[PDB]
Amino acid sequence: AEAGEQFGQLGRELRAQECLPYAAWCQLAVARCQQALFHGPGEALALTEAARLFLRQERDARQRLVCPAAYGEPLQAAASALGAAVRLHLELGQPAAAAALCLELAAALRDLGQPAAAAGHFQRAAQLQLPQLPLAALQALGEAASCQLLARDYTGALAVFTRMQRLAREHGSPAALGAFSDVLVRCEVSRVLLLLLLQPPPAKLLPEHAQTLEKYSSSGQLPEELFLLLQSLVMATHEKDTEAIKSLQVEMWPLLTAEQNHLLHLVLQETISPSGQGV
Amino acid sequence: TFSLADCIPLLRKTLKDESSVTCKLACTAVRNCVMSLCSSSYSELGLQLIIDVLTLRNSSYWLVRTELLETLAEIDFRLVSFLEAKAENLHRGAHHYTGLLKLQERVLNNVVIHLLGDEDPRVRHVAAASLIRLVPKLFYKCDQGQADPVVAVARDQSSVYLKLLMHETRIYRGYNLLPSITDVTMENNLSRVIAAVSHELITSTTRALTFGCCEALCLLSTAFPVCIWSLGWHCCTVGMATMILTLLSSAWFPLDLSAHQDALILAGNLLAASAPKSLRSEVWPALGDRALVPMVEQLFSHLLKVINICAHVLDDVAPSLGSFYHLPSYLKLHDVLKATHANYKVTLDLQNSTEKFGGFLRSALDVLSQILELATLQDIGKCVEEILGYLKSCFSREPMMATVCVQQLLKTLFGTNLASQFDRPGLYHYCFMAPYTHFTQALADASLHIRLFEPLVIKALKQYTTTTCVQLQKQVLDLLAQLVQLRVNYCLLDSDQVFIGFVLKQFEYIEVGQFRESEAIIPNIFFFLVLLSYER
Amino acid sequence: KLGMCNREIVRRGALILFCDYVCQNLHDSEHLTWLIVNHIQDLISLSHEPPVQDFISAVHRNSAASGLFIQAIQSRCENLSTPTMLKKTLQCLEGIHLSQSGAVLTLYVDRLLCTPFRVLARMVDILACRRVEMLLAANLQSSMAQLPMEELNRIQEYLQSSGLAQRHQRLYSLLDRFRLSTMVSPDKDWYVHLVKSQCWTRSDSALLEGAELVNRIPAEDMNAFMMNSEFNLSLLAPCLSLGMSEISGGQKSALFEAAREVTLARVSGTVQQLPAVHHVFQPELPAEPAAYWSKLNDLFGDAALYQSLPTLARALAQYLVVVSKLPSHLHLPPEKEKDIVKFVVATLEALSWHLIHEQIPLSLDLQAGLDCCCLALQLPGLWSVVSSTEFVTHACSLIYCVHFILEAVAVQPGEQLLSPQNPKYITAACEMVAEMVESLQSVLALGHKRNSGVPAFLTPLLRNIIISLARLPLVNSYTRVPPLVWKLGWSPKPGGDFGTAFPEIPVEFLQEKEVFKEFIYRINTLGWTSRTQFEETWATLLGVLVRTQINVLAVQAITSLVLSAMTVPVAGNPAVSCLEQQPRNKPLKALDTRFGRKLSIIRGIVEQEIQAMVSKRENIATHHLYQAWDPVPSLSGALISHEKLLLQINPERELGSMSYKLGQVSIHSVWLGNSITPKHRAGVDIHSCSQFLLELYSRWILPSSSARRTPAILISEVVRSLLVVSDLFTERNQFELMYVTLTELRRVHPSEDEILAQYLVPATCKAAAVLGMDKAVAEPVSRLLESTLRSSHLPSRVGALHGVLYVLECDLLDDTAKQLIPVISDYLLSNLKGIAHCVNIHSQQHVLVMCATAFYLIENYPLDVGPEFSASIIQMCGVMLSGSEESTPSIIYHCALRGLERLLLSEQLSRLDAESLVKLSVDRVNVHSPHRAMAALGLMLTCMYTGKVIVAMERVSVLFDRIRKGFPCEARVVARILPQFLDDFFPPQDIMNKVIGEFLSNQQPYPQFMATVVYKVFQTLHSTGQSSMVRDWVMLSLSNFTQRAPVAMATWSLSCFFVSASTSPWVAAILPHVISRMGKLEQVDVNLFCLVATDFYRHQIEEELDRRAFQSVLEVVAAPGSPYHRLLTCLRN
């Protein structure tokens, strides 16, 4: 009624004063006031805005001035506020709104050196958006796969990339729909690079992975130049042709993204210096 | 001894000028010659100019940013993709870059869609307008219709000159029943653009980006209808109806009259696009797909509330299906609409077309009329009374769309609406073979509950003889023609035949050139008369 | 000149139409040959068009037309080198006329077979195989006409001259099939030649096996072997890594000593070829000097010389990454310090030169060059050289090359890196470093949106290099100046050794917040280069403490500056050091025993592999996997080796995370080192500092008497700063004031503030813990957590829980304070129940500390908590282990698993609890995630080593399945720990068939890994007297050995198996050589088979009559011309 407006006035006044540690707390006080009146959209916005202020403070202390003494303390309060708004959004329906907030929390966590935590939140957002917005879920899943690679969970990223490819074919088919075609291209290249890096045995080789690898022994929605280079990489890896992999690594550099270029670099590095020997 | 290549350094130098006035005029100069240079032997210089103007998106002058958007909308990216594919040292730039230019990706994402989040609404409007222009000219690899950019460019040249010379109950705006034959290439380009704009909408932390993304999506649904390009709007479809309806049931988005009315148009367009596949032949019994019933129910209920608020504001009275008192969010919307109309009351800008209260009311009535197509008498017959009451309040402000809304109610009431009536290519192909086959083939064929409307009907007849708006005047004849088509006897409407005499006396001014826009009203006048030749 | 698209449309379209016209008129053969000899490159590129498809089809039906097709391709095959263009060329060349089989066959091998694109290489082989097939299936005399005898000989000689004979066996066999239709004792001298044949080659296929081959040669000949040219320089880095494993085991490594002295000799030798006078590398205009820039072109442009630099940098980077923990005599000699700095600059210049005149260099080459620069700038001996006045051009060259490399990778054309009296290179380098420092926020921030253009393997390298470069005296003063100050009215007169010694920012400029934030960023990112610089910024920050956002920022900035002094290796260097860690867990007495020592050996191997794949390498900048180290100095000092900190690190700290934590240093460390009953780090007086804030903060918050009662934003940060700074306190009196600083402030501050209570509670609890936790202090602080545990603000609760961990750490709690244990212990269970299986949806930090104190409470004070709490926790932390990756993050999974490992290793666990926790060590071994399976393998190893035919059988089975259904990295680790595992818990008879049986299975995906397991197991019985054991198990398994489904796998396994069961020293030493040649059946493999076989059959056998059984078994499969028969005929005489 009136207390919420006064608390909102205090929050913006402290924001202009750049005392947002208390302004977001004030924006949490109005959210408590909205709870007393059960104003769904009003409480969701108040909890949401308080979270962004908390994210800014953590970003200010970890990006603007990168203070060593910081230990992600504003992040804890941000997650509680964002998690409450996600819970409130879900209860009154609106799964997209809660999923979007999960994306915001995941984006902050990714940008604060926590890829593993960000990947979990990105996967959660994809699950919420999947029933209604398959395209949005694939984008959220793609963010999760990037975060898993940042956290060096290569098999975890492979599972996500396999899931995105299966969903893109199911919800976007035959031939792709263009928007899903870009997803399929990204999954197909990333999965092959991850499969070549991990080299699963026949016991662990799933039919989805086996079918994809058989295709590289037609082009689908992959460019002919990239498809032939990807085919050559698979044969070179299987024949242990080190010189061919070096030549292909340079040749495929402009055609791949930085994330894919890092995966290709790992494949070449693993071929020359296998890991697990302790030396 | 002057060389034409001597202003290319001069244009680049003036682009990086300390003065925003010179930079804006330098972008205009680039706009004139960028496409001609890319189409000539100096293509590397035209491509260089495209690279150099990309830095203008960060300019503090709003006129410079809009000039960049207009300049890039002129660029045909099928030609650019061809030049990019055969450029070797231009990808390196001045610092030996290791990747590719990706000019189309940067222009589309880092400029055109990025500027949809601009703080200035004018830049957002130009960015949205430049998005529609770029869609037909985008090129993507692995396309069914065009494998390489050369085929893509040759398609456009042969689509005009080699176009063979040949020739050959009303559903609302956003409905398409017959299966359209759409271009597969155009479907892919539209699908890619929509996904990019859609992704920015949820991953938006600023109000400006949400405002600009909804406006761009709404304009795309007008240039490329959702009902026609169903495959370009995600897998008949609805695409992002729940994506947009979330913003309608928000706290801050509805309070922006510009973006609120853009979401309403887009939300109605998306639901109307699924009509043929989501009809059968409870609540809303015409909808075969029950997943969309809450979506239609929520949108239909929302429109009545905002129309009620406009009715309340116009009748300046302080605040069942269209009740909004018990919702604080709708109370906030009323205060915004009340202030906007109060400004309109004390001014006399009669020729203004960008007024927000009138445009919002026009859009709310526009979408309500469109939604009425998917309706039956059963699910609206209980709620037809206050809508007719609402239309009376808003009739004086917007008589054109009120008559359209009345007509849609008559279709639903009489069972006339859609819900009540249902049951490899390369250069050789595009340049010679396909035009020759079509031409030779054509040569071969050469050888061979109503009484509630009456208070709102006499207002339309009364207003016809007192206004100079031909759009309203020609809309009244459409309503009158429909009433006669519905077998409503004309004696009930024109009791003293005073309307028909006014129409006949209008011909004196029409045929001496004293009627300002007689050309707009003539087709409806004569169709109305020939329909009256049967009525007795 | 990109030309006109409209011209191209006509150009391709006219050719398409002309081909269609020719297809209608085959009677005239004038226009057909005109297109073939003038437009074959265009015909191939347009072969997907229907008219061109028929035109090529028409050519393939005419012998004369097909002949022109082949001749035209050979004349224009250079342009047909693109993989897309070459793919179309083969498609058109597949249906060509039969009469032209000889001509097309010659074209395939001569110009198209040898290609780096393997998919096209096998396409040529398939087509060439088909062409020969029709050649010998047609008329003989016609086939001879198509293939001249000289041509048939030349085609085969080129195949043998190149490697294509072995790469395409079917084609060569078909070529041979057509031709006949148309008519010693293995001594030391023998060993050295074998490794000579492998190590003196430019092959990188087997470097791990190659490194082990030279390792076994005599140490005296080691120096001559590696220093001798034509030795593979790619084996230098593996030799150092392999030699490091021996040194890390205490044993002196001759291989590392030989490789180190060879690496430095080659590094110095390369420098000698550089120009005498060095100039700053100019990526834009390298032409003003004439001889200098031409001397680089003939040097960097030499393929042989350029390829040496990254492979030499690989060895140097491998050497510099372990030089820190090397003994005194193996350190970097001072005389070679100058050469290495020159070598590092030259390698970076060569990579930039390769970037300018070619495409991007190889990622391994690029990584090796930046690895050397990153590591060299961290060594104080090397950094002092590059920071000297004499090497001013070298420092500028490093800045120029690093900036050039970063922009060539991340910055697209038309884009900028930052998105909104002295030589000219001196100021340009200053501006380049300042730009790159700003790039550490967006462009080079790992995981950032702007970092999407940089591959993940370059971001950690460039961050460390830039910080080290920004610390150079050439650019340090300029870089610390905020850019906002530069655009304002500040412009002093620089002057010093380089003319860029700018003074510190005047205090008036820091009053504005936007420039103070930038100033705080620069000092925090780069640290302080000296004590004088530390005192400068200390006084500068103090001057800011004289609207309150400046006050809050200065207090936070002071906290970081004082905290920066605790980093162990180099106090002020962020690029080299991380915050000091003093674990609260004492070393385990369960180890270092007769079985604990062996457990540490097998767990240390597993621990090293866990670190390589689960840890975020915060304190590691390069790519080297086995370089994990913890900042734990010996406060008896030097850093403690990671192998001596098995399970001592705090469980609540994630693996490899080195950021500040609330329990960073234990109260035990405070007592030992400062002599406290319940200082000058790197020449910086922090006693004056730490005491200064104590008095400053005491008057800052406590006194409510004068005017204003300082605002609410400032009070919270003071307690946060006081809590963090307290880690550096030295005297108990300093801990007395910090308690009394907070005691009244608790009662003068209203209790309706939650952001304030989150810092107050742990600080008072930490202060009381050091102060004694006596009766007087216990009661007021005991109530403090209880009022904080019931908080709507979650960080206030974990921070309070972190205080309880401090409170009950080692200060023996009073028996009157026994009321605090149940309030938390039940809270430990009350809040964990709702999240024990859903930790993901809840805050991760709370669970980590909640599970951390539970381990300490159970381990140290088992009586304070009932058996219900202890028994539940093992079950409670077991449900989170046995869960999906989505339901349990890896950090939470690893913390609980590592805690149980220490809990079970410690004997304080009850008998019922200990046996219960063993039973969940089996379910967690078969998981999809390699790291979760590897982590549970360590738990299984400890659960079973501590427990020491019925249960061991069920466990060694999972050690063999994991090899059969695991990744090569996974299986290599398990195979490494297998020989010791089988030797200890299993009698040699008990598990011997399984070892041999798993070596022979069609279900075995890694025979090469099991070969070492058989080797180590065989030699573990040979060297302990059971030399007759191994012979009995050979004759038993020979019958099974002979029947292996491949013939190549059968002969290779027998060669490997004879090596394992060999008594000769030079025969057991070529195991890596025969492992590397897996699947090959060349001549040398055959002779190797016979040679190692006689070493068994002739030298040592059980008895004479047992030799008949050896002969009889092999006699069964004695094929006419197989290696088995050649084996038989050698042993006949």
Ligand SMILES: C[C@@H](c1ccncc1)N1CCC(NC(=O)N[C@H]2CCC[C@@H]2Cc2ccccc2)CC1
């Ligand atoms: C850039 C840096 C990094 C740091 C922090 N965050 C992001 C990136 N990182 C450092 C490690 C490096 N190598 C790596 O991951 N090898 C992986 C691939 C498969 C095998 C191996 C893991 C393994 C090792 C031993 C036994 C078994 C498994 C990649 C890049």
